[PDB]
Amino acid sequence: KTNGRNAQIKDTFNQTLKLYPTKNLDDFYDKEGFRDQEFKKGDKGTWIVNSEMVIEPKGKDMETRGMVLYINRNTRTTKGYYFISEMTDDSNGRPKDDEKRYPVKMEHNKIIPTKPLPNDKLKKEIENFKFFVQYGNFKDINDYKDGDISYNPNVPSYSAKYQLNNDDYNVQQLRKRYDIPTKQAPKLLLKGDGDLKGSSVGSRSLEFTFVENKEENIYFTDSVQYTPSED
Ligand SMILES: [Ca+2]
């Protein structure tokens, strides 16, 4: 059904999905996204890339691992960090939570820690890291069936939700790169806000939701966004 802004919503999301894959992160130095007057004249923009695997099983410790990189096209340098967040409850129900960040830089499509690590295995996990934009690959948005499109014109914000099967290319890639403890086929959720044609201030992201209830949350989030740079 093409009511309201459903077609415009699908169109903007297809523009996000078109970026999958971009195997060489250096390519971002030469990609120009959408520009407004939030970019100061001489600023060429920064590409922020972020992938995170959230695994919070029922009745168990919670853990998230991911990375963020800031690809600055002005300086042609890229810095960010890998992180491991852990949230646990001691026997009295008291939180014992932490998050550790390991600074890194990107050079010649390689991930290089800028501080040493506590062990070799973690060093390799950081060096071998691949953002979802480096191996994801979607079909045209319109090829995904029975989409649930939502639109709040006041923000404005929007979303498109689809049920995927376990034979989906992307799902198979996630199960190979991560130890996801759930047989369930995930939903793909596209989210956006700000002008439908695009904006600097606005956001675009995606998620693969394997489980979502009050006791358990297992999901994967990814975003690739063109933003004004820091001065
Ligand atoms: Ca935007």
Side-chain angles (χ1 to χ4, degrees):
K1 204 174 189 65
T2 64
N3 60 279
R5 301 300 183 186
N6 288 5
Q8 282 148 296
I9 289 162
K10 287 175 179 174
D11 191 358
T12 199
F13 289 137
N14 214 26
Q15 298 301 27
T16 292
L17 298 186
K18 279 190 187 182
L19 291 163
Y20 298 78
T22 301
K23 300 193 175 184
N24 183 359
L25 293 172
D26 289 320
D27 292 11
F28 288 109
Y29 292 128
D30 297 296
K31 300 213 181 87
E32 170 172 311
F34 192 85
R35 295 174 69 81
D36 313 296
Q37 297 186 15
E38 307 301 295
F39 287 89
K40 301 203 73 168
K41 286 194 62 58
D43 173 28
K44 293 178 61 176
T46 295
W47 284 91
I48 306 179
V49 166
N50 178 207
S51 303
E52 310 186 356
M53 180 74 236
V54 185
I55 302 176
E56 308 184 345
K58 177 178 167 292
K60 299 176 184 173
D61 297 355
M62 298 183 258
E63 189 184 75
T64 304
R65 303 205 187 204
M67 195 177 294
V68 187
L69 293 181
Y70 299 88
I71 297 160
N72 194 313
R73 301 177 67 214
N74 284 338
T75 67
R76 194 170 190 99
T77 56
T78 297
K79 62 181 178 61
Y81 58 90
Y82 186 72
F83 74 92
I84 307 177
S85 168
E86 180 87 328
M87 302 173 187
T88 71
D89 290 343
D90 71 22
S91 40
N92 297 330
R94 186 183 170 188
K96 275 282 279 281
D97 301 354
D98 70 316
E99 179 185 326
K100 295 177 183 174
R101 288 148 78 149
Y102 306 88
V104 298
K105 57 175 170 57
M106 186 281 293
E107 287 183 353
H108 314 301
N109 201 41
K110 292 295 191 64
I111 304 299
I112 305 176
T114 48
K115 285 183 173 187
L117 294 184
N119 57 66
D120 289 350
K121 221 206 84 172
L122 180 55
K123 183 176 180 180
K124 300 173 205 176
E125 183 173 304
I126 292 170
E127 285 172 346
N128 297 335
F129 188 85
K130 291 291 180 182
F131 285 82
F132 179 73
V133 71
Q134 294 179 269
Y135 60 80
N137 190 343
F138 296 92
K139 291 139 55 181
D140 193 75
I141 195 179
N142 300 291
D143 289 343
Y144 294 96
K145 295 295 186 63
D146 307 336
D148 204 89
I149 306 187
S150 306
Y151 182 46
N152 180 4
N154 294 326
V155 179
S157 64
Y158 27 91
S159 66
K161 193 188 294 187
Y162 305 89
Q163 172 67 58
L164 304 187
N165 293 51
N166 281 333
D167 67 13
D168 175 287
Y169 180 76
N170 296 315
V171 178
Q172 299 174 330
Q173 290 301 329
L174 291 174
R175 287 197 153 94
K176 155 181 272 293
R177 300 167 192 280
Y178 299 106
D179 184 43
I180 303 175
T182 175
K183 305 285 193 178
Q184 180 58 31
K187 299 182 181 289
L188 173 66
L189 175 58
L190 309 176
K191 308 166 73 172
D193 61 63
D195 291 25
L196 285 153
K197 272 94 166 192
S199 70
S200 301
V201 300
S203 162
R204 294 291 185 278
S205 72
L206 63 79
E207 176 185 319
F208 287 82
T209 314
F210 294 81
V211 182
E212 191 187 54
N213 57 60
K214 193 60 176 175
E215 299 172 350
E216 193 171 75
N217 303 87
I218 303 169
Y219 62 107
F220 181 84
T221 63
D222 197 73
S223 71
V224 179
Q225 301 183 88
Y226 181 67
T227 83
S229 307
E230 69 194 33
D231 74 338

